[PDB]
Design a protein around this ligand. Structure first.
Ligand SMILES: C/C(=C\[C@H](C)CCCCC(=O)O)[C@@H]1O[C@@H]2C=C[C@@H]1OC(=O)\C=C/C=C\C=C\[C@H]1O[C@@H]3C[C@H]1O[C@@H](/C=C/C[C@H]1O[C@H](C[C@H](O)[C@H]1C)[C@@H](O)[C@@H](O)/C=C/CC/C=C/C2)[C@@H]3C
Ligand SMILES: [Zn+2]
Lengths: 99, 49, 49, 176, 1111, 54, 197
């Protein structure tokens, strides 16, 4: 049903989620047990905090700084790979592990 | 009050009658015994413990 | 052995006296309040309790 | 023993440190502990820098890198009912009085810029990038105005001389 | 008496006492001096048990040594603990935040067995913290106090239950050790004695007996009479010792294949090999006294024995037999009865010495495992004890015991009474003790073996009631950890003066008389029938030939702070509890006047709390000032005592110490030489003496409210000084280093006037909430600007100013002067933590008056906030023009059973005006048993009614009848104790006489300025987006579940939608609400909460498909 | 010995959220081995890589 | 008792294959943040250790399978991964709970919901609110029944944006910024505005 939550709801269906739903929710597969670079304090690539998977930390900024304002929005940096948008999508995007 | 709203079986569980009629009282060894004679063709209900 | 509401069960007797008639026999039960609130119709109010 | 030590140095810490820095951290700890046992006094950073033949600022950098993080799910108070994560102020949020002050500042700046003419306000907004994100340069405004950049620059200088008047400054002074 | 600088405080005490009060910090001090092994403890133990002088460290080092390898070819042993001098004195440690300590030294000895070499080295064991003069520890500059703990002692605890199905008695036993395994010999619904070992239930007694190697013949011989034992020996269904051993091994082990050498060693490892089962000397004494095994043998071989196990089974089966006494062969007879777990013969007191010894032992075990590890991997003929020992687990165990453990508490000090009763405190809960949910209803009760060992009145009244109490006055701790109490022994009806300290079991063996029994001034009793206490706490009368013990004094059964309540014997117990709790929360005022009517326990409880400068050695005063006194001793030497002018206590109260001797006087050894925080001429003084009337006045003193005159605000009667500190630290960062400076960006020159050149404030600048204390600036880094900011900076010409300002602003609702600036640095080589460059502390101090809302209380639990401070002239005055000061309420007295306040009021008026009993024709009949020099007293005289032996009611009537006039011929108070007040507001007299007198009230630490709070919009939480909590941050109040239930029950729904969406979680709703309020528009319609969105994401992350549907 | 003031490692700006114009952009269609299709919108002047991590 | 769950799986459009798990999902990082404090000190959120244990053991199992190992090592590694995922979903359910430093059991995913400290009874039903206050009470016997007293030092903080708008409207301040600074300095006209608001 709804996914942008316009406060017009009539049901709330729970259900037992399959692997085909799990790998449909997720944006990128996490594959390394790293969180943050120890020296520059940036989120690591392919870690549990990766900006390609979960979105950017800075508002309308990619990882390599090639696109840094609102005129480049909704695109993906062809070098770094972070979709340039607001930084509040790190609260809503999920990842997954392939066992 | 808490045992009433939770509908547990109580501590001092007093049995009640199940039919009209007279009783067969017994003062047993350390615990009594009560049997109720029905006014119809039924078996007399026994309350032992 | 499944506890269902008096309204929902009696409406299901209305649906089953037609299309081949037999009644599901039921006897009324009295359940405590933790047992009653958990078997509600909403899984959100029950899980929050 | 090599596989055990390498794998422990890789996957011991929540923030991953490369193995050479973990080696110098372990050496620093063993050196400080042995000098404490043989000395009876916990040594100085310059003593440890003397013993490991490095600089004291490198010793302080290593002892700052060696600190492992804390967990947000510990009991802060006397009785255990309060996590640490319930008492950390989120400084990256919105202060919610400066946002509405920013909105009123935009409206006040609109009124002040609209008290001038059309060419001046248009050149100023294109110069400082108000209607759009990117500020147009002097060549861009001379292109969009059908002139040279020198006339644009003279207009810019005259308008900046105009806007420092107290009649156009007494309302905007309290906004900084 | 018998204190050389005492004020003459005349007492109403009728009966002499033999024993003076012992030193109140003796429990703390003597336990620590036991742990160290100090020579004072050495000579005391030589006086009282000279067989074995053993310290705590010596006992731990001797239970550790020797330490060998598995082969037994090399051994490392320990010897001779020995301390050094302390590294820094007390005040320097409190200044520079160092911990008061001293190093440990140990003579270690490594012995090789084959060739044979001993190696003696002096291993530095660690830095050991040392106790101060007053029984407090200093950790990191703070001051700490270790609280004692109550636990149940090891031994055997036989006890019975009913089964409520067959209604037969099912006895049991729990052989609970210290650091071991358990074992229980129950009796089931049948008669098969179950031997559940380590909580693995089955296997009747023949399993353990033939497992021990006992044959059926010997089982028949020792257990022949018992029908239960012969029924189990027929229902054993197992013959053979190995047949029992395989069952024991397969049930206790399971998951390991049995063999005939493992079961041979498993049982001998569990209960006899002392490396895994060591019930202590307490447990050995308890078991050998319970069963009667050995009597005169000294306590050694701290593990069990098969003799003790079969004695336990024999005692259990004779207890179920219903016998009276049993003699096990080989020992003296003993009575056969069940045991209690709340009797004070079974609850020992783990004090501070045993508490530190436990942590040292648990550090030494982890050191021992490392030492015995590296005694093999290191090469032989190459090791040394300096290379063997790693002292890091011992020093970490000590550090983790003192810092951050719930029995090592931060010492509170708002008055010396609260310091003194923060020590001497018994708590039943802690590490190794029961929690508050495991706390049953039975453990909170007052067992009748608490008489004189623990106070029944003084306890907290929250959820922790009964679990925390305090020691009594004369009580003393046993060597084993029990609690001893004195008793005067009476021989043949002749009360002697020998004093015998008795624990609970011996207190049960004899009978014990009453304190205020009528002795005939010879040792003989007046009446033949005396009240007495029997064995089980029964209270009977008795012929006086049977009485063999007598109490030392009344007030023996009561604590320190409860013995400071006058007329305790008239109050209730709950209001006395509230009075004893609220007596210690008093604040120190500026004047601190001594109370008129008190008990005798102010002088001793003040000079024993250590917060009064006491002259160590006698002599004459050379020089006094407000800082230092130099006495001149009898032989040449002098001695400076430094005062403490305005030190900050541990809770923000003042700690003044003014001197009370002049420059010519002669002091003796022990004389009080300077007052403390809450003292006046040596004794305690927690408040002021205030005139009070007991009428209800116009609803302002309604339902426990108190009104006051304006004279207390004017003359500074009630005024405390509070001192707070603020702390900031300039440290390094990633982008650079923060600096403390005057140049703060985007700031005016108006706030930069009070700041001096190095950035911090001057001394004496009166500050308000929001002013700059320390001017600190951070390197901001690189940020992009908004175009409005860019063109505004272009318009005014001002630069970027690339460093961000983060100063130390004084928080909301605080003011006062600035006392002192203690600023550390790195360049001046101070011990700063790693990464810090400059530490600085600023001390702000305010002088709070009294105010409506502040909490006041008397000494009988009559609390109440200040309702309204009246002016002086609209306050009901007497017939002399004297206005009253406070006005209490009538309706709170008779329904709370605390008329001790009315008796204290009457006797206070008598003590203020002063009396003269006219014995012109003989001493009158009321005062025939009064002492001399109480027939007359001067005005403003002090008196002292002790706790349970004081001023009688008839003597109060007689004193109140003859009450000599003020200045004119004017007896303002008649014989009832009442006066005819005039209404200060209307003008007419009140038509009925009203009780007046001089009460004593104290100002508690519940002031308004620490409670009033508000919030418009402050900070927010991190994970969820709710506002924060508490007055320390800005924070908002909690609108919990029950208030949501009330808002639902009103039918008011829109307010619930408000408070649950657009004030807490609507992240885009809050700023729209603020903008709509400021611009003046209607409030917008709310949206969904972020906490619900977080709930949805967690449910999606638990592999649960949650799809929200439109239709 | 300070105040608990946290900050996530990242800055929050606020500019004009306008959707009426953006930069022009292409869409590349990437394909894995197991019959999957993916769309990644790159910009117009962008060297589209021949492989991609999907 | 069996027909309950069998008819539950039969009636709906559900499949029983989702009780085993072939792909674990990851919660977003802003609900388990790594926030740095003032002064470089960092704070994890206690789920990163469980996630890192699962990631470590999964990578090691993949390497063991591709390397070619005897059955003992691979079976022990698979039971290790199974125990790690079970500890992630509910720590302390089966066997010993996974403890971190200081012998404290880690806060798993189910512990964000269970008991009193969960989302339900702590943050969903009752929240901290704004525009609030707290103080001690006294008896006010001159008031009428519908009235209450209020300290002005507290009502000045409750009614701050109302009084900000009102004293901007009466030309006592040029804009909202100087009005807020005027409230913070508590100038002697803000009470005369406070009575009206
Ligand atoms: C609940 C508790 C202690 C409470 C925090 C304080 C006492 C509660 C009783 C009461 O409500 O009055 C238990 O205390 C210990 C074992 C575990 C428990 O601690 C707990 O589980 C809770 C905390 C354990 C260690 C805390 C260390 C730090 O917490 C803060 C700083 C450090 O120490 C604490 C200092 C407490 C001193 C208190 O002292 C009391 C008055 C005030 O409540 C406090 C000033 C005085 O009445 C004093 O006489 C009472 C002392 C308690 C007796 C010893 C009990 C054993 C302060 C609160
Ligand atoms: Zn990039």
């Amino acid at each position: 049903g709804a996914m942008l939550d316009v406060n017009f709801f009539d049901e709330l269906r729970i259900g037992l989620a399959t692997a085909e739903d799990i790998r449909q929710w997720s944006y990128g597969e996490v594959k390394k047990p790293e969180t943050i670079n120890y020296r520059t304090l940036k989120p690591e690539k392919d870690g549990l905090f990766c900006e390609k998977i979960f979105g950017p930390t800075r508002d309308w900024e990619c990882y390599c700084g090639k696109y840094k304002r609102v005129r480049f929005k909704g695109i993906i940096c062809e070098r770094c790979g972070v979709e340039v948008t607001r930084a509040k999508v790190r609260r809503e995007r999920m990842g997954h592990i392939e066992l | 009050v808490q045992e009433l709203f939770e509908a547990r079986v109580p501590r001092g569980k007093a049995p009640i009658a199940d039919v009209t009629g007279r009783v067969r009282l017994e003062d047993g060894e350390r615990f009594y015994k009560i049997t109720i004679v029905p006014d119809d063709g039924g078996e007399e209900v026994v309350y032992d413990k | 052995g499944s506890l269902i509401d008096r309204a929902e069960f009696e409406a299901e007797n209305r649906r089953v006296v037609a299309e081949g008639g037999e009644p599901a026999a039921g006897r009324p039960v009295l359940m405590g309040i933790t047992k009653a609130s958990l078997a509600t119709d909403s899984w959100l109010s029950a899980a929050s309790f | 023993r090599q596989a055990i030590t390498r794998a422990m140095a890789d996957q011991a810490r929540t923030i991953r440190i490369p193995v050479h820095m973990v080696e110098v951290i372990n050496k620093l700890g063993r050196i400080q502990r042995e000098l404490l046992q043989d000395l009876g006094r916990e040594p100085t950073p310059e003593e440890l820098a003397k013993e490991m033949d490095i600089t004291p600022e490198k010793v302080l950098e290593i002892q700052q890198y060696a600190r492992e993080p804390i967990s947000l799910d510990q009991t802060i108070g006397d009785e255990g009912d309060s996590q640490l994560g319930d008492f950390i102020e989120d400084s990256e949020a919105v202060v919610a009085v400066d946002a509405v002050s920013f909105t009123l500042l935009q409206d006040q700046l609109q009124s002040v810029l609209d008290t001038l003419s059309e060419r001046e306000a248009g050149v100023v907004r294109l110069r400082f990038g108000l209607t759009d994100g990117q500020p147009r340069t002097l060549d861009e405004i001379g292109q969009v105005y059908g002139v040279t950049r020198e006339r644009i620059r003279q207009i810019e200088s005259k308008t900046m001389s105009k806007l420092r008047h107290p009649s156009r400054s007494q309302v905007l002074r309290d906004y900084l | 008496n018998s204190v050389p600088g005492a004020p003459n405080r005349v007492s109403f005490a009728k009966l002499r006492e033999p024993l003076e009060v012992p030193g109140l910090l003796d429990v703390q001090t003597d336990s620590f001096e036991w742990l160290i092994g100090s020579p004072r403890w050495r000579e005391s133990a030589a006086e009282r048990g000279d067989v074995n002088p053993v310290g705590g460290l010596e006992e731990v080092l001797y239970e550790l040594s020797p330490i060998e390898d598995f082969s037994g070819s090399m051994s490392l042993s320990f010897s001779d603990p020995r301390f050094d001098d302390v590294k820094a004195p007390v005040d320097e440690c409190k200044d520079k935040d160092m911990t008061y300590a001293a190093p440990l030294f140990v003579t270690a000895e490594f012995i090789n067995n084959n060739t044979g070499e001993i190696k003696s080295q002096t291993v530095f064991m660690g830095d050991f913290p040392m106790m101060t003069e007053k029984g407090t520890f200093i950790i990191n500059g703070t001051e700490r106090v270790v609280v004692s703990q109550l636990v149940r002692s090891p031994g055997v605890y036989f006890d019975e239950t009913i089964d409520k199905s067959t209604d037969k008695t099912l006895h049991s036993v729990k052989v609970i050790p210290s650091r071991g395994a358990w074992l229980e010999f129950d009796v089931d619904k049948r008669d098969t004695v179950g031997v559940r070992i380590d909580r693995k239930r089955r296997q009747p007694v023949t399993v353990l007996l033939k497992a021990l190697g006992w044959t059926s013949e010997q089982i028949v011989e020792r257990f022949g009479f018992s029908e239960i034992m012969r029924s189990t020996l027929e229902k054993d269904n197992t013959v053979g010792t190995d047949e029992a051993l395989l069952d024991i091994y397969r049930k206790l082990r399971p998951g390991e294949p049995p063999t005939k050498e493992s079961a041979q060693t498993l049982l001998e490892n569990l209960f006899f090999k002392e490396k895994r089962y060591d019930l202590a000397r307490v447990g050995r004494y308890k078991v050998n006294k319970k069963l009667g095994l050995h009597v005169g043998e000294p306590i050694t071989s701290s593990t069990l024995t098969e003799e003790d196990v079969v004695a336990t089974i024999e005692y259990l089966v004779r207890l179920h037999e219903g016998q009276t006494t049993m003699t096990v062969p080989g020992g003296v007879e003993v009575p056969v009865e069940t045991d209690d777990i709340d009797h004070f013969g079974n609850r020992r007191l783990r004090t501070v010495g045993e508490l530190i010894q436990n942590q040292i032992r648990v550090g030494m075990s982890r050191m021992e495992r490392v030492v015995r590890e590296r005694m093999t991997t290191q090469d032989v003929e190459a090791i040394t004890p300096q290379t063997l020992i790693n002292i890091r687990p011992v020093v970490a165990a000590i550090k983790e015991f003192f810092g951050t453990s719930q029995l090592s508490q931060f010492m509170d000090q708002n008055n010396p009474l609260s310091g003194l009763t923060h020590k001497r405190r018994l708590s039943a809960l802690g590490p190794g003790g029961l929690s508050r949910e495991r706390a049953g209803l039975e453990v909170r009760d007052v067992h009748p073996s608490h008489y004189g060992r623990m106070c029944p009145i003084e306890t907290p009244e929250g959820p922790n009631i009964g679990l925390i109490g305090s020691l009594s006055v004369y009580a003393r701790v046993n060597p084993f950890g029990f609690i001893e109490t004195p008793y005067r022994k009476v021989v043949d009806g002749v009360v002697s003066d020998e004093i015998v300290y008795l624990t609970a079991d011996e207190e049960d063996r004899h009978v014990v008389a009453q304190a205020n029994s009528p002795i005939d001034a010879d040792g003989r009793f007046v009446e033949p029938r005396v009240l007495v206490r029997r064995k089980a706490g029964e209270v009977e009368y008795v012929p006086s030939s049977e009485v063999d013990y007598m109490d030392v004094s009344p007030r023996q059964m009561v604590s320190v702070a409860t013995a400071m309540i006058p007329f305790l014997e008239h109050d209730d117990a709950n209001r006395a509890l509230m009075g004893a709790n609220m007596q210690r929360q008093a604040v120190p005022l500026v004047r601190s006047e001594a109370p008129l009517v008190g008990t005798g326990m102010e002088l001793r409880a003040a000079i024993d709390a250590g917060d009064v400068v006491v002259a160590e050695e006698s002599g004459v005063i050379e020089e006094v000032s407000a800082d230092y006194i130099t006495v001149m001793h009898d032989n040449g030497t002098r001695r400076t005592y430094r005062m403490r002018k305005f030190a900050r206590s541990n809770h923000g109260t003042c700690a003044n110490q003014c001197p009370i001797v002049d420059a010519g006087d002669r002091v003796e050894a022990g004389q009080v030489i300077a007052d403390g925080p809450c003292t006046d001429d040596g004794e305690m003084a927690l408040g002021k003496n205030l005139l009070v009337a007991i009428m209800p006045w116009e609803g302002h003193n309604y339902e426990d409210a108190i009104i006051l005159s304006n004279r207390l605000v004017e003359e500074d009667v009630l005024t405390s000084i509070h001192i707070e500190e603020h702390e900031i630290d300039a440290r390094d960062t990633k982008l650079g280093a923060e600096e403390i400076t005057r140049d703060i960006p985007n700031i005016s020159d108006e706030v930069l006037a009070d700041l001096d050149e190095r950035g911090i404030v001057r001394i004496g600048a009166e500050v308000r909430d929001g002013d700059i204390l320390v001017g600190k600036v951070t390197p901001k880094g690189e940020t992009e600007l908004t175009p409005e900011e860019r063109l505004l900076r272009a318009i005014f010409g001002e630069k970027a100013r690339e460093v961000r300002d983060t100063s130390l602003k004084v928080p909301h609702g605080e003011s006062g002067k600035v006392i002192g600036i203690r600023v550390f640095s790195r360049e001046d080589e101070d011990e700063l933590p790693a990464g810090v460059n400059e530490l600085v502390r600023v001390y702000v101090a305010q002088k709070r008056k009294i105010s409506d809302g502040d909490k006041l209380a008397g000494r009988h639990g009559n609390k109440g906030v200040i309702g309204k401070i009246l002016p002086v002239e609209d306050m009901p005055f007497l017939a002399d023009g004297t206005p009253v000061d406070i006005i209490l309420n009538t309706h709170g007295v008779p329904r709370r059973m605390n008329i001790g306040q009315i008796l204290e009021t009457h006797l206070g008026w008598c003590a203020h005006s002063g009396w003269k009993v006219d014995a012109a024709k003989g001493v009158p009949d009321w005062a025939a048993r009064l002492p001399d020099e109480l027939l007359e007293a001067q005005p403003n005289a002090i008196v002292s009614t002790p706790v349970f032996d004081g001023a009688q009611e008839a003597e109060l009537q007689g004193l109140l009848s003859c009450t000599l006039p003020n200045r004119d011929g004017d007896v303002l108070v008649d014989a009832d104790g009442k006066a005819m007040l005039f209404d200060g507001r209307s003008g007419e007299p009140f038509p009925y006489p009203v009780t007046v007198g001089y009460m004593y009230i104290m100002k508690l630490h519940h002031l308004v300025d620490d409670k009033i709070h508000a919030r418009s919009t402050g900070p927010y939480s991190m994970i969820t987006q709710q506002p924060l909590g508490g007055k320390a941050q800005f924070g908002g109040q909690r609108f919990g579940e029950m208030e949501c239930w009330a808002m639902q029950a009103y039918g008011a729904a829109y307010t619930l939608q408000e408070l649950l969406t657009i004030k807490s979680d609507d992240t885009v709703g809050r700023v729209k609400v603020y903008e709509a309020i400021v611009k003046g528009e209607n409030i917008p319609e709310p949206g969904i909460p972020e906490s619900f969105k977080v709930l949805l994401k967690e449910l999606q992350s638990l592999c649960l498909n949650v799809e929200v549907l439109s239709s | 010995d300070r105040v608990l003031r946290g900050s996530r490692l990242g800055a929050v700006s606020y500019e004009t959220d306008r959707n009426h114009d953006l930069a022009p952009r292409q869409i590349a269609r990437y394909r894995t081995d197991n019959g999957e299709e993916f769309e990644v919108p790159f910009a117009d002047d962008a060297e589209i890589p021949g492989t991609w991590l999907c | 008792k069996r027909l309950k769950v069998v008819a539950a799986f039969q009636q709906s459009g559900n499949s029983p294959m989702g009780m085993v798990l072939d792909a674990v999902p990851v919660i977003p990082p802003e609900l388990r943040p790594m926030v740095q404090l003032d002064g470089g000190r960092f704070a994890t959120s206690d789920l990163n250790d469980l996630y890192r244990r699962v990631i470590n053991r999964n990578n090691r199992l993949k390497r063991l399978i591709d390397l070619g190992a005897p059955e003992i090592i691979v079976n022990n590694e698979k039971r290790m991964l199974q125990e790690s995922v079970d500890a992630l979903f509910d720590n302390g359910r089966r066997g010993r709970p996974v403890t971190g430093p200081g012998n404290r059991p880690l806060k798993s995913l189910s512990d964000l919901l269970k008991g009193k400290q969960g989302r339900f009874r702590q943050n969903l039903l009752g929240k901290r609110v704004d525009y609030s206050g707290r103080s001690v009470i006294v008896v006010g016997p001159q008031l009428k029944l519908h009235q209450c007293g209020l300290p002005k030092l507290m009502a000045l903080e409750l009614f701050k944006p109302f009084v900000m708008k009102r004293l901007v409207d009466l030309n006592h301040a040029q804009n909202i910024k100087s009005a807020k600074r005027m409230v913070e300095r508590q100038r002697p006209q803000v009470w005369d505005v406070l009575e009206e608001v």
